[PDB]
């Protein structure tokens, strides 16, 4: 990334020898806009996993069963998605 930046920089330099900086600043705004929420989500998840590890002392075996049933449902609807993509691409290669 740095190398491509420097190459284009050299080109622009050989061309030279305020709107752009304000636009770059606003882009720097946009970049972090979502990242603040990424931090907030990861923080709420850190609190959640900390609370769960507080229960990680022993607990009752059933939650695994719940996650396994949701896992089979997830893989099933995912097979729906993947089979759908396969069938549509096969219709394309037919066309």
């Amino acid at each position: 990334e740095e190398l491509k930046n420097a190459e284009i920089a050299l080109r622009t330099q050989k061309t030279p020898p305020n709107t752009a900086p304000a636009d770059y600043f606003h882009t720097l705004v946009q970049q972090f806009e979502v990242q603040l929420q990424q931090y907030r989500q990861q923080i709420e998840e850190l609190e959640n996993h900390l609370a769960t590890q507080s229960n990680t002392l022993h607990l009752s075996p059933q939650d695994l069963s719940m996650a396994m049933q949701k896992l089979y449902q997830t893989f099933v609807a995912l097979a729906a998605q993947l089979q759908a993509v396969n069938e549509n691409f096969k219709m394309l290669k037919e066309q």
């Binding site: 989500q41 709420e44 998840e45 850190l46 959640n48 996993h49 769960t52 996650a67």
Partner: peptide
């Protein structure tokens, strides 16, 4: 486990 933490988060959010 950050994916496990995310999945526990998805349990918590769903």
């Amino acid at each position: 486990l950050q994916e496990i933490q995310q999945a526990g988060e998805r349990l918590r959010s769903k």
